[PDB]
Structure formats: structure tokens, C-alpha cells
Amino acid sequence: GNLSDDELEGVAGG
Amino acid sequence: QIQPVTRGRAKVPVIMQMEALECGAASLAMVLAYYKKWVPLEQVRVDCGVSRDGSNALNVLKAARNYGLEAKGYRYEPEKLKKEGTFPCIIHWNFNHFVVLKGFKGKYAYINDPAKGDVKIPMEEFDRSFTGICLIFKPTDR
């Protein structure tokens, strides 16, 4: 939406 | 025919993570189940790329897209999530975790947490626990 693919790739969770 | 909810809360079935690293996959499984896209949970884990670092938002979104959902990632402050969010959506939680946001009512956020089941979070706690990242889904042709 307002985030690039690389920024989304760094959002991580279990 | 099932659309996202923009007004109240989405009725979303509870799926628990079978182990701690799986929250991403459990959360997308619940979103898939809301739209009645039947995909074995084992398949979802593998398509989300569950690793020793859990999953990441880019891979959750890519897996959702291959299953026929339109999927976008936003950074929202809490107040704009409340205003413009659609439900269910997946949200990043304590910098660690993914949960499914079903919506808001009163002083409460309604979540399916893969570690806890269906919970009601007080707004103040919601506001500190939501990190800002929100994955927003819509069915296929548009």
C-alpha cells in the first residue's frame, strides 16, 4: 500500500 | 461473494499456531478460512516460508496472492487503522508476532491471537502492542 517490498521483507514474526 | 467488513467486526474462526514460529501462517489460515479458501495448514506454513525467524510480511502477502486474494501492506498509526482498516486483516504485534484483527467495539480490539485464541484487548494496550504494520486483503477480480 505505502510500503515497498524490501521494507515488508524486514517485518518478521512467529 | 464474501467481502471484507469495514464497519463492525468480522466473524473469523480461531486457528492456533501448533508451534511458536507459526503465527504468520496461522494468521493467513484464518484469513483464508474467512473467505472459504480451503488450503491445508501444512501448505500455508510452507507457502509463507516459516523459518527459524518465523515469517515475514512480504512472504505472507505473496502466499495470499497465489491463493487468489489481493493483498497490500500498509504502515498505519493506530487511529488510522481504526478509521480506514478493513477486517479481517493481519497486524504485526510486539515486534515479534502476527495476530488477526477482526475489528473494534467500544474500548476494545477483537483479535484471534494464534498463541492465545480469541481475545479482547483494551485500546490502550492495543495502541502499544500494534507496531504499525497491517496487511489488508480483498477478494480477487478487484
Numbering used by the authors:
A (entry chain M): 1 to 14
B (entry chain A): 5 to 146
Q: Would you copy out the relevant sentences from the publication that reported this structure?
A:
The dual-functional transporters, called ABC-transporter maturation and secretion (AMS) proteins or peptidase-containing ATP-binding transporters (PCAT), excise a leader sequence concomitant with the unidirectional extracellular export of the mature peptide. Following the installation of these posttranslational modifications, the cognate AMS/PCAT catalyzes the removal of the leader peptide via cleavage at the double Gly motif and extracellular secretion of the bioactive natural product. We show that this protease can remove leader peptides from a large number of double Gly motif-containing peptides.
A shorter construct, including residues 1–147 (hereafter LahT147; as identified by secondary structure analysis) and a TEV cleavable His6-tag, was used for crystallography. Incubation of peptide 1 with LahT147 prior to crystallization yielded crystals of the binary complex that diffracted to 2.0 Å resolution. The crystallographic asymmetric unit contains four copies of the complex allowing for multiple independent and unbiased views of the protein-peptide complex structure. The overall structure of LahT147 recapitulates the α/β fold observed in the structures of other papain-like peptidase C39 members, wherein a central six-stranded antiparallel β-sheet is surrounded by five α-helices that pack on either side. The catalytic triad of LahT147 is interspersed among the secondary structural elements, with His101 and Asp117 situated on strands β4 and β5, respectively, and the nucleophilic Cys27 on helix α1, which borders one side of the central sheet assembly. The peptide binds in a groove formed between helices α1–α3 and the central antiparallel β-sheet. The C-terminus of peptide 1, which consists of residues Gly−1 through Ala−3 that correspond to the P1 through P3 positions of the precursor substrate (per the nomenclature of Schechter and Berger [Schechter and Berger, 1967]) binds in a linear manner to the corresponding protease subsites. In contrast, residues Val−4 through Ser−11 form a short two-turn helix, which positions residues Val−4, Leu−7, and Leu−12 of the leader peptide into a hydrophobic groove in LahT150, located roughly 20 Å away from the active site.
